[PDB]
Structures are given as structure tokens and as C-alpha cells.
Enzyme design. Structure first.
Site, PDB file in Angstrom:
ATOM      1  N   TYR A 193       0.825  -1.206   0.000  1.00  0.00           N
ATOM      2  CA  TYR A 193       0.000   0.000   0.000  1.00  0.00           C
ATOM      3  C   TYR A 193       0.861   1.258   0.000  1.00  0.00           C
ATOM      4  CZ  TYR A 193      -4.118  -2.855   0.950  1.00  0.00           C
ATOM      5  OH  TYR A 193      -5.136  -3.776   0.869  1.00  0.00           O
ATOM      6  N   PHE A 230      -9.101  -3.840  13.720  1.00  0.00           N
ATOM      7  CA  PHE A 230     -10.140  -3.310  12.841  1.00  0.00           C
ATOM      8  C   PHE A 230      -9.784  -3.561  11.377  1.00  0.00           C
ATOM      9  CE2 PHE A 230      -7.250   0.247  13.658  1.00  0.00           C
ATOM     10  CZ  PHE A 230      -6.951   0.664  12.374  1.00  0.00           C
TER      11      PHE A 230
END
Lengths: 401, 404, 403, 404, 406
Positions: free
Chosen positions: A118, A401
Site C-alpha cells: 500500500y 479493525f
């Protein structure tokens, strides 16, 4: 053929989540999907839909993270980033990234955070975690460690959730990287998920009480009974003072029938590592935790505090979002921070990704410069800036998360 | 019956060393024993002898270590610490420790260093090392990593030793914890030891040359050919260093792109090894962190004044040395990037800690703040630990020297 | 005490099936038992019953198999052959074998086929299968392999079944050993069985489409997420394509999937095209094992139903020990465009058993190798050389869907 | 800087071989190097030398191979192909390949053969995998034969290498005409094949030799194997051959019925090894298939006319040779069991394929039809591939020769 | 805050058992809990309760055990001994043991027996390891019998649990008098012993039952076993129990399991260290034998216990017994025993052997040699030659074995 859009209703939500699990080779975990819905904002959950199914997803939760210094700022907790293997190499990920990063900026969030799974979008690994494990019978503490006069009991989830939030809220200002937990996030963090029950056992809760009765520490763990070597899988241990912390760990380490203990997602500077008398007995494997994407560079750099005085000019290049490129003067210290455009000569040249990597004090700017990833333009600048971007307490991984 | 004495002659040296290997359940390694003798001072190797065997040993080499800031200071490199399993619980270790630490003090060495195999003697773990490993085909670098235009050659040990010392000497002032290497220490470090051959293979040497012919990097490694089923040949890296980022990256790229190799392992790397940040996919390079070097401060004010500090600090430390109570005292440390002084003071103390924990933070490898939060160090005045912890740190983590 | 009979009703069917699973140490798979019932003929499922339990079973499905040359002939797909451990060594198997083989003959099936789990009954291993596996990151294709401009979708079972049968039907004439698939057989082949979910995961379906929209390839696979280092796997059940581009592109889709580390394809052809697309063969491990056993029931007809890779005019002295009426001296004349076989009084060229004749019948076992091993005898010089080449085929036989 | 040349003398030879072993992560195997020298022609061993060491190598042995049909033709047995990891990406391999392939052509050899391993040249320069080998293994107690397997009246004796070498060549010479891919073995090649090498001694044990005698005393079978004692004892079989089915089956039965042995392994067997069909329970003998020999056709018309074909064929092949474009063209092959001719033609082409894939089908181990179905080979006229695929096949699969 | 009491009702019983499973890091097994309730006496299940949760448990079943010689006597089968991890080092375990040992004494039971897997009280309070078990395993294809082993002419059948329970209790009752350590099984214990527990289904598979019939048709042997199908060729048979009324039915039953198709490995946990199978196998190295503790014995009524059992040979010895946990049992006893007689009582005569009550329980079942305990220094001989004669008499030609689990 494809439409980028947000989740519309509950059926659309379950189909969205099912596709994201499916890309990751898993059946949808209905218990986790149900509990996480309570803090999900559908308008933050975007993706590409082909009229019959979701083919790509990207979402974010509105959270708050502790910065070095104790400031708690809004952060986009990015989640559920998938592209179906049938729809790869169509630019869908770049489109979702551009849309989401603009949306994050509009909400006043100065940065985004994502769990490593990323760099070309500006994300850089900023915090690490340690998997600590070892034989419990070898994990005696140094003789000077005070266990205190406290006591502890194993409690129900409801009793746990009536004391643990106040303990957590009291300790996190000194632990950069940790995130605020509403009751809804505690419900997800303490869920007795079927996926984790398969790996070990039902979740259990421990509360540490001082001699006066006040709750000062907690632990979340799961047992893995012997299948041959019984293991304890620790999810979290925190205390408001060194005695409750050490006593709680001593409780887990002295439990009969247990042979091995595992703590995944610990801090790389977890206090347990230094309580143990014989360090080699507690194996420590370090890996990536959180990636940071700086969205508002001046505000992010001015919102944290710095371990020492710094007056440095940064030539920041943002390839994915060139609007953020610029030359910024950072004036910071323990009790002040400012960041503004300047035309003075630059001291350091770096990308926004590498600036994000050093932002939480978990990665040394000096090592990045020695590696050749960051360039020093004026002598002695990197050394002082690297110490300033550091912090005496290493950043640590928030709840998942 | 037992006599505390030093080594007397060459036959006594071989019996001494054979005893130390025997305590650690190994046969005496004659090639290591022979090469290390060249830098061994017999009067620094002590132990207990019962009239026919050495029953306990403790030694030290005269070495020099790089401190945070680049200063190189004399250091006692403690080695060969054994007690025979039949002679435990007699107090031989404490007696040898008292003698050696006293000898270190009279020699004027401000600190001792010991590889973790002792906290009650003042030794505290100050540096860590990382074992880095992974599948080489997964270890592509980030795209912005410049490999340069250099070339590499695999060379004999002789040709390696004609260029590696100058490369090593130029890099270590920025790598605290590294130690000076004389030709004798290079000879032991590059020995094709039989014990390491059995684990992998014969040691190999690589030199990296700039486009003008300047040797700017080197590597020491051993191949471990495949023994499966399936391919599983490994490279065991002993050391990689370069004088610039390109030479370092290109040397690693040479090892990682070698045919037939499946897995690479680098034991004793820095916990902040540059390789960890060149790799595009961090999870492909596993990182296991463990104790490396323990520090025993012998001259507290001098040791504190010999290093430099990552930021300005003015802190008063109440230090307790249980084993050597003559070192206990209250010291005012005034330090920074460009200055350092430490001296007895009468001002109020800011931090209370033991000499062991002070040694643990001395190289910037352990945070004084974490020790305080752990309850091992006591903050006496607010805000003192946080500023002292930052100052005792360093932007470059300390790393393990060549083994001793 | 024991009665040889067929399945009487539905309760008798579930008891019959539960008996077979129990012999093989498994609980009855109710989902498999239910779906397979739709193509099961109760009068073909025989066994011994002691009055309260089934103690031995043997059944056959009415199927059709592609022979070398493309001809589709009726075949008995023998299944559920079990003898309870408490009733072994009583001759129950020989009895059922004698009854089934006679029943197969009356139904006009020239041969029977059975998955290897029997040589004394005339069954010989005629087809092999390969388990192909490897690290997906090492499985790049040769640079000349054209992947085409097609696209792929992961679809539901119903969408899969609206396109896969036509693809399958177009491909199998070139793959001897494959069997026709009715919708009922497709229902079993695509069942999301709880047995295989435990080993990996829920079954998935892939369709490959040409640029004009026509479906030209498909894949059936199951994921096995990481349970450890990473080690997620894909278990491929079937990949087929009507052209080389669709086949290669579909395999490329599975091999380039993120998170996957290792791929496994059990029951592939020993000459699976994937083996030759891979640039580095050692990265794709190939384990060869028994697949299908053949029992020739009508020898002259079976020999006349297939085609032969080259011309052949050979006299075979065939011995059928289990069914002596099949023994005879047959003159086989055949080729790519003809095949005939009948009794002859001419000199015999080759002496072999019916077991070994079935082993070479699908072109997967060399008659010359069986002769060099001593299992087959050459009576006249040069005869085996040509007969072996003729019984062969340029495409190796492959295993059908499991039965 | 780099010079392409042949080996000059014996010291040059030992350094050349040492470099080739070093590239493959191994110490030089002096026993293999010494025995293989006896059949090495130094003028066929080329490589690049930088003035002080060899940095790339490639060699060839003058050998002869059995083709489908029985004809024994000269072949270049290519060997010792390495490029030092420091000298990759400089074009050294292509240069050596052009030199070697031209030299093979001028020596009258119509093809080159090379063991597929982790070799640098795998798949490149026109080489195509034409032969596979099977690793057969299993529990010897599970490996009973089919009941009709006749073991005969023969007897067996374990003998010395010298006794073995007085009977094995004649047995071997009588069997190989029917086994395409096998190569001629001079006494020099037998010496290498039967060497009790220290490398294989470490993996199992000292080499042992078995001879099988018919009832009249004539030797009719042999075996080469090494025991691996329990550390579950294993037998590692190197070769088993017999002039008749009884001697072959009896020699295997001797190995399978040996007391103390639990597992047997035969690496490098034929994929159609007769043992696979003698065993009663096939699953008990695991069969792992892998690449064995790659073929590089160098004289296409002569290679195609030197073998025989399983059936009649008349086909025009459009051959593309990207590496050696002088060989590209349309060849008309007219072949059968008792004839074979091939010449360049301008007639219409039936099949289009590369010289690599033509080499892959040349020994009958790879089906041309499967290559066409995979898309690597293109059919230009209907029905051509089917007949050509059958003709290129053979009733006996090719097998791997002794290692080189 | 804490209260020592017994189980009050059914809800209290399930909360009691849930706490016990939780201490041993396991979820409660409701199938085991339900079937075991049929033979559970709530007044024998004691523990500590803090007002809302059980913090410690200690229970006992009223059972009967076979002694060397064949005598069946009542015994307390101690079970469910747990202490909550947060309530350790508080003295709760001692208190429970004292109350239980008194309750066992008042019920007329001369001894208490406790499985070694109850690691909470291992080797304390006077409990001594008296019986061992063996785990026998091997590849079934290497487990041929000696050629002189008669398999008889019987037949076997795999039957339902109900059909099994109609013939197995008769077989079990006729064999146990010759197997010391085994316990009487009522129909309620048979229901628990044959339960198709989900716990064991995960480890292998559903429980199966085999009956061996004689030529005339009478049931003469049985087997309990579970299959474990091949995962990943390695299918296994997990044998729970095999018994026969004659050597042929025993050998024929094992031969049925050993010759079963598709099986590669067999495992028999909880077998006797002298299981007859070990001597039937022709190649002993093929059947691995791992020996471990099984049953611990706490002698409560010393004179009655020593008199209830018979002795393999004559003995007249004086034992100076020391009971540190229950000093009221301490005393100097004269033991006169043999194959057909046994008596024991306090005496003034000079003592021959000095030993603790823990070691007396160890030798009581004849699974531990008294001579070896003296050789190791755990037992002191006071008059020469007494230990050897006492050790031989305390032994038995058939080793004690482990009963069904409790």
C-alpha cells in the site's frame, strides 16, 4: 458495468461484508459482522458493485488515536479493503483510494490508519507489534518486581465491561497508537467469536483489584486445552500501576495445567519483556502493525508532541496526492509544535510515506536515511529530527479493525 | 584445595580452554583455540584450579568499543565464564567476579561487556540482536532503492582482509556497540571453523567495488546446500557492511538473487538493520529479537561522560551498586550531542536506579521510561525520566560486535 | 442366514448406504446419499442382508464413457463395493462379482469400470491420475503461452450449471475415459459436501468468457485458508476449456490469486496440459497413481467400439479365468477409421489374460511393457510392437468424475 | 577482461571443476573429479576466465545414445554448465551456448542432451525436456508381486566392484537396444557410475553390487544399491537390469525380501519401469515423475532420419529455431518402423512448432498431440498432429541414462 | 465469604460441574454431565461456594473394587477435585480432603481411589500411586500372533449399544474377579462407559461395539472401539476395552480388530501393564508399551483394608505405619496373610518395616514392589528379611489394572 457507491441497507451491508470475507478465502463470520455493524457508518463503506455482487470494497471507521504527547485526534480506521480476484488490474483500487482519501480529508481527519495485510498510495508502516511466547514455568520475574497487595477474580463479560473501560481510559494517554473505545467497540473487542473459539477456547475475563477494592488492572485471555501442552492466548493485559500489571501477569503465568503462553499484538516495548528475569525464555517476534497515511501534513505534524526540540525544513513529496507536496518548516518540542510552508532551504527530502512511517515514533528517520530512502540535505539535520520524531514510549497496536 | 590463579603457559592455556568447552558440553575446538590465543593475554584469564584440572574460568580481552556519538573507549570484553558442574554452590563465581571487576578497575577500563549466555553482579542487557530470515524470492526491495553501478567478486580470505578492515573502520563510528578489529581479531572473525562448516559450509567472502574500483562493501556468508524433500538450500550470513547506501543494498541484492538459494538467515543483525527497511514486504523478513550484550559500568561518572546524548539533559541520578558499593552515589549528568559531563552532586536526585539498569540504558538499546513504567526504576521528580530516557537513547540502535 | 438381494425401498437405501460408509470407517454422508439417489437404480444395487443389517454391498450406475476415437458407449460404473469386516473370508465378494458381471452383460454394456480403492475378477488398471501441486508463485507459464483476451467471473452453482455442461460436452470427445454428465450427475459433482468443507472450504465456481460473451472455460475449486507462516491453499476439482487460451487463462486466474501459497489438483490427467504450460516443471510436483480399472464383459464388441492409433491385424489368445466363456482366440483388425474383432482359427500372435487386455484397452498402459515384464507373452515376432502402438492413443485416458 | 577458452592442463581442470561445484554451493568432490577426468576431453570443456579464476563453464562428453528403433548415434552429453553469481547478466551464457552448439554440430553430433536439474540452461536455447524419470518408493513388506510373476531358478550373490564389472557390461549391452535414452558405457564410464563416492556415502552407505546368475551359471541380471541403516532402514537403489523377465523380477525380489529393510527408493527409474507392473498393489509403490533429459536438436534432418517411428508418417513440420535461425524451415518427415527420411522442403506445412518442442517429442516421451492441445504446437492441416503424435511415440518410454 | 457445602439441586449440580470443567480449561461436556448424574449422589459432592460461583470442588462416587484374590469391597471413587485459580493458596484443598476422608471413613469404605489425571492432589494427603496403565500401539500389519495361539471357532458381530449392553455385563462380571483394580459396573455406569461422547468423536469417531459368540451362540467376548479415518494412509482404531471369558474369545476379538481392512495403526490406552495382548503378539517390538500412573490409593481403615485382600504367599510382618495427614490411623500393625486368609491388628511386638501410609497404598494393590521402595530409601527395613517376604506377599500374579474412568 461497475458502479462505485456506498452501502444502502442492512442486506446490502451483509452482502458487502460477505464479499470481503470471500476475497480473503473465508466464510463470513456472522457474529463479528453483527457486532461490528453497531459502529459502522454505511456512508463510509464504499465499493464497486456490478449489479449482482460487490466486486471491490473499502471502508473506514471514525476513531480517535493517541498521539505522542497524549493528544487524541480523529483518525480514519481503514478496513475491509478488497478487490475480487476476477476484477484485478482494472484500476478499481486506485479509484477507491482517491475517493476515500478525499473523503477522509473532508471529515477533518488528519491521517488514516490501516492494519498491515500500500506504499504507492502513501501508507507507511509506522508501528510494530511483538508476539511474546514461552514456557510459563520459565517466566519468573526479577526479584525486585513488586507484585503489590492486590487481588483478582475471573469475572463475566458484563462485570468486566463495568470496570475495564475506566482502567483503559486511564492508561492510554501514555500509550501512543491506542484508540478510544466506545461501548460498541468494547463489545466487538470482547466478543466470544466462533473463529477464535476454534483456535483456542471461550474468552475469559480477569479483573485486578487493589486492597481497597478499586479496580486497577484487567486481562483478556483464552485457554487452549491440551490436544496432544495447554496454552493461554492473551489478548490484552493492562494496569494503572506497575504492581497491578505485574500481579495480573503473575496470575496468568502461575495457572496450573498451563505450559505455554502467547501474547500476540503486544508492544515491542511491552513491560512484561523487562519483568522477566531470563529474557531468552520469552521469545519476541516483531512484525508490522499499523500503517499511517498522512492526509493533512501540517495539521498532523502540529498535533503531536516531539521528544526533543526540532527546527527542521522538510521537502515532502506526495506522489499519489501531489496537492500535499511542499516544503514545510517543523518547529516542535515537548510542549509545542507548528508546521507551515516556508521558502527557506530544505534540510531533509522525504516522501509522505516515509514521513508517515516516522510519525508515531516507531521508525527511526536516521535509519531510513542510512538505508537511502530519505535524503539529508544539510548536515546534522536528520540526527536531530530523528530524535525529535521518536518518543520514550514506543507506539503500540490498537484493538483490531 | 582450590587456587585462584591466571594462566601460566601454553599447555596451561589449552587445559584452561578445554575446561571451558567441557562445561558447555562441547569438545574443545582446536582451530578456535589456536587463533584466539594470538589476542589472549594470559594474565587476564583467571580461574580456580584444583591441582589437576581447571574447575572454573573467567577471562577478559582488552578491546575498544564505539559509544553513542562515535567515541571509541577501552572496554573489558569478558569471556569464558564457566564453573564446573561438580563445583557449583561453592561461591567460585562471585570470587572470580570480584577479582575480575577489581582488575578491570585498576586497569582504568570504565566498563565491561559480556555476551548473554549475572544481574546480581551489575551486568544489564544493553543491546539486542535480530535474527532475520526469509525466502529470498520474497525479498524484493522497494522500487526507490538505488543499487548503484558497482560490481562484486567472491574472493579468498586474504584478498578479503586487504579491503574489509578499511570498510569496517569507516562505518563503525556510526554503529555504537561495534568494536575495533585488529588483524588478530579479523583472523578469528574470518576463521573457517569446523563447527560452523558442519552447520552450513565453508566460509565465503564477497567484496563490493564502486565503478572506479574502490572497495565499498563486503559480505561474509556460508552456503548450506539442499539436504531434502524439495529444494531448500540456505545462505547463512555472518556480516554485511557498506560505506554508502548503494553498496550495502547491492551487496544484499547479490546474496538474495543467487541461484539455488531458497532461504537466507542473518543471525546477530541489528534490530534496526537497514535491510529490514529496504525489503518491500516486511512480513517476508522474519525478525526475532534477543539479548546480545550486557554492560557492567565500572567507572560510572567517566562512562556517562564518554558517550554523547541524543538530546540535551540535566538530570541527577541516585545510583545503587549492590555488588560494588563503592560505586553508589548521586551523580549530575549534563549531556547533549556536543558535550557530556558527570560528577558527584549535592542537588536533589531526580531518578533512583541500580547500576544494572543504568548499564541497560547506557547504549541506547533500552528505554529508561519503559523500565520506570515497569517499576524497576523510580522517578523522584516529575518529568525527569521522560527527558532522561530520550537523552539516553540514540537515533541508531546499538548492535552486537563480533563474537567473543 | 444371508440373502443376496437388491435395494427394496428408500429406508432400505439409506441403510444400504450407511453400511458402505461404516465399512470404510466413516459416518454416513447424508448430503451425498440424498443427491446420488437421483441417479441410482435400485435394481442395480445388490448386497447380502442377514435379516437386520446389510453385511456386503455392490452396485453399478448406468453411465456412458468416451473411448479412444470419440465413441460414447454404455458402461457399468461400479460403486459401493464393501464387505463388512465381520463377514470377510466367506466368498461374499466372489458371489456378488459373479452376479454383477452377468447383470452387466445382459444390459448391453460391453465393459465395466471401477475406481481403484480385484484383479482376480478380471479388473485391470487401465487409467492413471496425477496429483499436481506446487507453490503458486513458482508456476509461471512459458512466455509463448497465449492467455487470450477473455474474462472470468466467480458464480453461483446454478449460473455455473447453465454454462459448464455445454463446455464439458464439447471437450470430452477428445478425452477418452471421461463420462457423460446428466443434470443429476452434475448435481453430485458440484455438491458442497460437508466432507470436503472440513478438508478445505465451501466449493466455488469460475466461468471463463470470450470477448464476445460466450462461456468457454470453467473451474471448480475450494479454498483452504491459512491455519499455521502463511500456507493458504486452493484445492482444484476440475478445470476445462474449449480452446488453449481459455484453459491457460483459467489456470492463470487460480495461480495468480492473492493470499494463496500452494495449489493442489487431485485426479488430473497424467498428461494434463497444465504440466506443459508451466515454465519450470520441477515446481509442479506430479504423483501418478491408479485411477480406473476396466473389466471387459463383451470382448469382441469392446475391441470393436474403440479406434486404434495405427493399423493393426493381430490374433489374441485371451484367457478369462473368472468367466471362462469369454476365453477365445480373437483376430483384431483396427485403425483410426475401423475396428473389427471375431473368433479365428489362425495362429495366435499374443497370449494375455482379460485383466491385462483391459489394462491396455484405454491406451494408458503399454502392451509392450507388460510383455517385457513377463505378464504378457509374444507368440510371433514383431506382433507386440505393432499391437502396443495401436492400443495406445495420442491422448492419455483420464479419470472421470468420482463414483 | 574475460577470455573464452578451453581447459589447458590438469591444474586448470581442477580449478575449472572447483568453480562449477562452488557455483552450486558445494565443495569440490575430488573422487568424482578424478574418475570423470578419464573420459573428459579438455578441448570440449570451455568457459570464461578472468585471469585468476573461472567465472563461467560449459562442457560436453562424447557419448552415444540409443534411439527409438535401436540405432546408437553420437550425442553431446552436455555437463558442468555454470555462471558465477558475480558474473550474471553479462551475456556469458548465450556466448557459451552459441560456441558449444556450433562445436557440437561440427563434430557430427546431430543432437545434444543435458540433465534437467536446477541448471541455468533449463528450458532455454532450444533445449526441450524429452525424457522423464520416476522416483519409486514404498514399504518393502507391501510390495509383493502379482501371483503370475515367474521368478525363475536363478541365484544371487553380492560381489565386489571388480567382479561386478566383469559381468554387468555384457548384461547392460544386451538390454539397452530396447531402451531408448540409454547411453553406451565404456570402462571409464562404468568406473564413474560404480564409484563409491563420499557424497552418496553420507546420504546412505557404501555402494554394493548384486549379480543374478541363471541355473547354468550365466550372469543375467545385476543391481547397484546402497543401504541406509536405521537412525527404519532403507535401500537406495541405483540401477536394476535383467536380460529376461525372470532375472529382473528375481533381482527385485532379492532387494524387497532383505531382512532389516523397511523402505526402498529407486530414483531415476523409467516412468514405465517394469517393477511398477509386477507389484500387486500399485498404491504401495509411490511414483513421482519429474524431468530427466533435455534434447537440443542441432542437425534436424539427420536426427529425424536416425530414429524409427512407431507408425507410418508423412508430415511437413514448420520449425522455428529462435536461437539458431539457420535451422528454421519446413521439413518433410517420412518415417515408419523400418524407414526414416527428412529433408528441407517448400511444400505446404502440416504442423508448426519450435525446435524446443520438436526436441521434446523426439524421444517419444512427450505427446505431440498434448502439446497441440496445450497451445504450444499449432496444427495447420486437419488430422496431421494425430498421426504425427503416434509416430513420434514409441511402445517403450525413454529413460534416463547414467548421470552426467 | 466462602462456604463448604454439598450440591443442593440440579441447577446447583450443573453449576458445580461447570466450575470443575472450567478449572481444567475445558467447556462443560453436557452429555457426560447428564449421563453421570444417574449415579451421582449429591451429598457426596462437596465444595466451596462464594455466594455466586463454586470456587472449589471435591466429589466421590460410591463404588466397589476387586482386590487381589477376588474380594469385592466398597470404595470411594474420588472425582472432580478442582480449586479455582484465583482461590489457590488459601487452604481450601486441605479442608475438602479432611471432610471427604472423614465422610469416606463414616461410610464404612476402607479406602479411596483416585485417578492420576486429577493432577490437583497428585501424590499428597496419603494418596500413593498403586496401579499403572499401559498405552499399547503399533502398526496392525506387524501384530501377528504366535503360531500356538488358539483363536477358537467363534464368530463376531458389530452391534448396537443396546444389543451390546444385553451381553457385555455378563461377560464383564465373569472376568473381573481375576482382574484386581476393576470396579463393579451397574447399568448406570455402563451407560456412561459406553456413551458416544462428542469429546471422543472429535478425537476419532462414533463408538462401535463388537460381540464375540461361541460356536453354540453364547457371547464370550466384547470390544469397544472408535475409528479414526485417514486424514491428510494412516487410519487408526482407538480401542477402549477388550475382554473375553476364555483365551480364544480374547485372542479372536483382538484378531478381528487387528485384521480389519483400511486400518494402519491401533492404540489401546488404559490397558494393563500385563495385558495378555502383549504376550500374544509374536514380535513384541511392534507393540509399543508406554507405562504411566493410573490409580492412587488412600487407605482410610488400615486394618480392614489389609484384611480384605489376599496375599500371593504367606506373610507374618509388623508394619510401623505413619499417617501424617490423619494421625489417628498411625499405628503398629501385625499382618498375617496368605492365599486363603488375612488378618491385621495393632500389636506391641517389635516392628519389622517402617513406612508411610502413602507407600502402603502403593503396594496394597500389588502394582508397586515394596522391595524397590526400600531400595530407593522411601521405606525402611527394621528386621532383616522382612521386606522381601512382605514384598512377595503384597504382590500378586496378575497385575492390578485401571477401571473405567471416573
Amino acid at each position: 458495468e461497475l458502479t462505485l457507491r456506498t452501502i444502502a441497507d442492512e442486506d446490502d451491508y451483509e452482502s458487502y461484508m460477505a464479499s470481503a470475507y470471500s476475497v480473503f478465502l473465508r466464510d463470513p463470520q456472522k457474529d463479528e459482522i453483527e457486532v461490528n455493524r453497531k459502529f459502522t457508518e454505511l456512508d463510509r463503506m464504499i465499493g464497486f458493485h456490478d449489479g449482482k455482487k460487490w466486486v471491490a470494497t473499502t471502508g473506514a471507521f471514525s476513531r480517535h488515536v493517541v498521539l505522542p504527547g497524549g493528544a487524541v485526534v480523529p483518525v480514519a480506521a481503514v478496513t475491509a479493503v478488497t478487490v475480487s480476484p476476477t476484477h484485478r488490474r482494472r484500476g478499481l483500487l486506485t479509484t477507491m483510494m482517491r475517493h476515500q482519501l478525499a473523503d477522509i480529508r473532508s471529515r477533518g481527519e488528519s491521517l488514516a490508519m490501516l492494519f498491515a495485510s500500500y506504499g504507492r498510495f502513501g501508507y507507511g508502516v509506522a508501528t510494530e507489534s511483538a508476539e511474546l511466547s514461552g514456557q510459563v514455568r520459565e517466566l519468573a520475574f526479577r526479584p525486585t518486581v513488586d507484585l503489590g497487595d492486590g487481588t483478582l477474580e475471573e469475572v463475566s463479560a458484563e462485570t468486566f465491561l463495568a470496570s475495564a473501560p475506566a482502567i483503559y481510559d486511564a492508561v492510554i494517554p501514555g500509550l501512543p497508537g491506542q484508540m478510544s473505545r466506545t461501548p460498541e467497540w468494547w463489545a466487538s473487542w470482547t466478543l466470544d467469536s466462533e473463529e477464535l473459539q476454534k483456535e483456542s477456547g471461550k474468552v475469559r475475563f480477569v479483573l485486578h483489584y487493589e486492597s481497597d477494592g478499586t479496580a486497577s488492572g484487567f486481562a483478556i485471555y483464552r485457554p487452549k486445552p491440551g490436544w496432544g501442552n495447554a496454552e493461554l492466548h492473551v489478548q490484552e493485559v493492562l494496569g494503572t500501576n506497575p504492581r497491578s500489571y505485574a500481579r495480573t501477569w503473575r496470575y496468568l503465568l502461575d495457572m496450573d495445567l498451563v505450559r505455554k503462553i502467547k501474547y500476540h499484538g503486544a508492544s515491542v516495548q511491552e513491560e512484561l519483556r523487562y519483568l522477566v528475569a531470563n529474557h531468552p525464555s520469552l521469545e519476541c517476534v516483531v512484525s508490522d502493525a499499523i500503517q499511517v497515511r498522512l492526509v493533512d501534513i501540517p495539521r498532523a505534524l502540529a498535533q503531536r508532541r516531539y521528544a526533543a526540540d526540532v527546527d527542521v525544513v522538510l521537502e515532502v513529496t506526495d506522489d499519489f496526492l501531489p496537492e500535499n507536496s511542499g516544503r514545510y518548516r517543523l518547529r516542535g518540542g515537548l510542549d509545542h509544535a507548528s508546521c507551515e510552508i516556508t521558502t527557506d532551504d530544505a534540510d531533509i527530502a522525504l516522501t509522505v510515506r516515509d514521513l508517515g512511517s516516522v510519525y508515531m515514533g516507531g521508525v527511526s528517520l536516521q535509519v531510513l536515511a542510512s538505508a537511502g530512502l530519505v535524503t539529508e540535505l544539510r548536515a546534522g539535520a536528520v540526527q536531530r529530527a530523528a530524535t525529535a520524531f521518536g518518543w520514550p514510549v514506543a507506539p503500540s497496536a490498537p484493538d483490531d479493525f
